[PDB]
Design a binder for these strands. Structure first.
Ligand SMILES: [Zn+2]
Length: 835
DNA sequence: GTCAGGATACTCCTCAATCTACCGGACG
DNA sequence: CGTCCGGTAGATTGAGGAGTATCCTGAC
């Protein structure tokens, strides 16, 4: 039974049609459990009929002990390699395996399943000892080189001119193997050998960049195109050579470069696309197709489908962006008006590699997954919004009942496992390994699910299964420690690195095994461990850092980057910026500490001088997580923005006194001068006669001005912002303290007294007012605050503790305030200090 | 019958940022 | 019973770079 479509597809090779029509029963007898798709795939090739005949003749012998080839392997060899490859495999069963070559049957299948794989097999047989002995090449590397179309030519060219690149050009064997491990690797290798000095000297290209260009399929064309078009794109189009290298470092990079040259003016002057966006679109595999599709479909997808150009760029910035864009154009109304998906969900689904497949699979499987399995559409969208999401969706549809029934997993656990790149592999690995891990090693299903949730969870699960009996016995590690190490992105690498490096780190550098486990329990923990091993003596000896400080720096997600940045920037920050090593270590000991350190180095002079941000304030701002965005936002709001916005941004730094004396009132001016002098003395900074005269001039010149004394000493002056309290934003509460004379003092919630940290009313506006009255000896005051929830119970009860003996503070909430609970208050209240 | 170049899809590993979730100490 | 408070630890959320894999077309 053959489908008419199958016959139409197979009609490419009429001899295969005759062979299938005549001896199909023999085909299925020699190859049991062979699907029709495999048969039509094998037959339709250039030698389908003869390959099928040879497979029928040989499959009775190729299943022998030397190879034990599966039916699928035989079908793949016959479909890809051809009849010649099958005959060569049959004729050299004894020579390939169990020989000095020492090739496993999988390697033989991988080598032979290529166009002209018989020649590759013959060449690898003839040259394996030569490259393994003289050139010192691993058999894995030789197999990888020979497992490509035209692998014989690449292997011969490597054997001929590996030393020429190793000595006369300084190219390591790994780089040459990477260059020659692609289709037509002989051409790329010869092109590198001919053009490396020219590109490195005349065009100023690093050999790493040239190798990166050539390490792709058809890299000779990319190299020649870079040589020809570097000046044109660098000068006439204003493109950085690194951008050109990034464009040309993909498969078909010559096409991308030519398309960029031809379409940059059009996309930049007729569609409003920035050159950075064009470069981002073209910096992916098949970028010429993506650029042409964007040029054709931007008006259609923007005017009609209501998609912003940024969404179209994000969709088109992936591999196969043409397919994703066409699929979005075709299926946006279908997926929106029928399946209920919002357009942003469709864009999120389509914004990955193979987004067309994900979109089609979502369209096909959303009712099935939502109705038969009870999955929420948000869960299906979350599964699909990943690389290879079609495979994950199909695997979920196949394995949800068995995983939720046999192993007792909940559907939420399965969805969490499958919501990552390669979630199909993780799901299959879980379904295969959970009984083994749980019954033998004692792991609980929750631990297995936690291990398998992250990216590459199949590798982590296999590594855990292989290494737990070794790590937990030889190195004395608790199974919880092993699970914690493995439950991270790239946890296989961290597990192997720990197994290799725990003894040397625990005897030479003296680190505790707990410290090693803490270092290795983060993303990229292998790199952090290697960096610790390399840099611990250097940092501890030259820079005077204790091992605990280095461990604290490295125990983060970017520990390697933070350690390298500390090594680079400790002296320059210490001597040219006046920062103690403790502050540098505190900045570096956070997620993304490299960015924080670089931002501190960049912005310390401007913040400390132009704005007067005491270095301690900058260090405290950067010492928290997200130091780079916080510093950037503070600098941006300081350089330009509403005066009120800068006012709050500089209240939130702490230690600043805002005063808004009213009228001229010379007595009132002297009182304000006394208050600002007292605050400056408390901060240990003397304003001196010039600043005192300037501030009197400012107060006597502009009515309604507000003064702001920074702890550094700078007196910010805002001529006019507001005479009324700003609207409550829900996070920061503002207050104004009014004395008898009339001067107003601005207060902001938070940044409470460090001495009274144990009090539950620290940082509150009423507490701050009471503390100010106590320090400045003010008998009577009224504080108006803007919080609509009213004064909390803490300040209701504990305010009188801070007020001086025989004082009075009147708290006033806004008129429209409503109490948020029973303990709060909602009216003006007078507090008298006690003894 | 091989060899080369291009397009597309899937899987794995680092890095950076933000988001919860508790935890702590004194007064009517 | 009451945080306009911070600190610590853990968990998502997102992006980017790299590796692996297959298939199709064109040319001798
Ligand atoms: Zn309060």
């Amino acid at each position: 039974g053959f489908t008419h479509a199958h016959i139409v597809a197979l009609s490419q090779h009429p001899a295969a049609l005759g062979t299938v029509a005549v001896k199909y029963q023999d085909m299925i007898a020699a190859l049991p459990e062979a699907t029709h798709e495999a048969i039509v795939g094998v037959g339709k090739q250039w030698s389908g009929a003869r390959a099928l005949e040879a497979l029928l003749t040989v499959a009775g012998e190729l299943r022998g002990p030397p190879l034990q080839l599966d039916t699928g392997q035989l079908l793949k060899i016959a479909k890809r390699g051809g009849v010649t490859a099958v005959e060569a495999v049959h004729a050299w069963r004894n020579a390939l395996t169990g020989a000095p070559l020492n090739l496993t049957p999988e390697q033989v299948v991988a080598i032979a399943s290529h166009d002209g794989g018989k020649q590759a097999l013959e060449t690898v047989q003839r040259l394996l000892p030569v490259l393994c002995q003289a050139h010192g090449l691993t058999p894995e590397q030789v197999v990888a080189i020979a497992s490509n179309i035209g692998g014989k030519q690449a292997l011969e060219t490597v054997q001929r001119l590996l030393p020429v690149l190793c000595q006369a050009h300084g190219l390591t064997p790994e780089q040459v193997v990477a260059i020659a491990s692609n289709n037509g690797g002989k051409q790329a290798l010869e092109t590198v050998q001919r053009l490396l000095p020219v590109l490195c000297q005349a065009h100023g290209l690093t050999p790493e960049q040239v190798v990166a260009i050539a390490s792709n399929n058809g890299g000779k064309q990319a190299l020649e195109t870079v040589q020809r078009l570097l000046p044109v794109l660098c000068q006439a189009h204003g493109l950085t050579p690194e951008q050109v290298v990034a464009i040309a470092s993909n498969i078909g990079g010559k096409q991308a470069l030519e398309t960029v040259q031809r379409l940059l003016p059009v996309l930049c002057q007729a569609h409003g696309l920035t050159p950075e966006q064009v470069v981002a679109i073209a910096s992916n595999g098949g970028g010429k197709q993506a650029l042409e599709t964007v040029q054709r479909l931007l008006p259609v997808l923007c005017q009609a489908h209501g998609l912003t150009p940024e969404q179209v760029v994000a969709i088109a910035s992936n591999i196969g962006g043409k397919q994703a864009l066409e699929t979005v154009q075709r299926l946006l109304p279908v997926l929106c008006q029928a399946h209920g998906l919002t357009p942003e969900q469709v864009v999120a689904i389509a914004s990955h590699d193979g987004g067309k497949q994900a979109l089609e699979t979502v369209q096909r499987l959303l009712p099935v997954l939502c109705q038969a399995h009870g999955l929420t559409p948000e869960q299906v969208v979350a599964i699909a919004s990943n690389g290879g999401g079609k495979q994950a969706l199909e695997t979920v549809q196949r394995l949800l009942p068995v995983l939720c029934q046999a192993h007792g997993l909940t559907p939420e656990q399965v969805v969490a496992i499958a919501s990552h790149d390669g979630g199909k592999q993780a799901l299959e690995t879980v379904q295969r390994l959970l009984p083994v891990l749980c019954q033998a090693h004692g792991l609980t299903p929750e631990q297995v699910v936690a291990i398998a949730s992250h990216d590459g969870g199949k590798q982590a699960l296999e590594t855990v299964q292989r290494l737990l009996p070794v790590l937990c016995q030889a190195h004395g590690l608790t199974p919880e420690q092993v699970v914690a190490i493995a439950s991270n992105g790239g946890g296989k690498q961290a597990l192997e690195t720990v197994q290799r490096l725990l003894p040397v780190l625990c005897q030479a550098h003296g680190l505790t095994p707990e410290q090693v486990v803490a270092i290795a329990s983060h993303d990229g923990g292998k790199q952090a461990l290697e960096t610790v091993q390399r840099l611990l003596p250097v940092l501890c000896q030259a820079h005077g850092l204790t091992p605990e400080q280095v461990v604290a720096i490295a125990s983060n997600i970017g520990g390697k980057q933070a350690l390298e940045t500390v090594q680079r920037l400790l002296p320059v920050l210490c001597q040219a910026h006046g920062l103690t090593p403790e502050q540098v270590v505190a900045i570096a000991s956070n997620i993304g500490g490299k960015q924080a350190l670089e931002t501190v180095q960049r912005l310390l002079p401007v913040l400390c001088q132009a704005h007067g941000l005491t270095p301690e304030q900058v260090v405290a701002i950067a010492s928290n997580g997200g130091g780079r965005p916080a510093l950037e936002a503070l600098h941006a709001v300081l350089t330009d923005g509403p005066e009120e916005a800068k006012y709050e941004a500089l209240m939130r730094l702490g230690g600043a006194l805002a005063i808004r004396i009213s009228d001229n009132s010379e007595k009132q001016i002297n009182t304000a001068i006394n208050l600002i002098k007292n605050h400056a003395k408390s901060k240990g900074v003397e304003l001196s006669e010039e600043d005192i005269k300037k501030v009197e001039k400012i107060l006597k010149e502009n009515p309604g001005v507000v003064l702001l004394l920074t702890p550094s000493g700078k007196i910010h002056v805002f001529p006019s912002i507001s005479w009324s309290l700003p609207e409550y934003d829900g996070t920061t509460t503002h207050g104004v303290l009014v004395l008898d004379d009339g001067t107003q003092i601005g207060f902001t919630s938070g940044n409470g007294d460090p001495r009274y940290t144990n009090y539950r009313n620290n940082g509150h506006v009423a507490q701050k007012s009471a503390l100010y009255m106590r320090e400045n000896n003010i008998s009577n005051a009224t504080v108006y605050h803007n919080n609509t929830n009213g004064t909390c119970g803490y300040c209701n009860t504990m305010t009188a503790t801070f007020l001086p003996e025989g004082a009075t503070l009147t708290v006033v909430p806004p008129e429209n305030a409503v109490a948020n609970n029973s303990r709060a208050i909602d009216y003006v209240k007078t507090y008298t200090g006690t003894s």
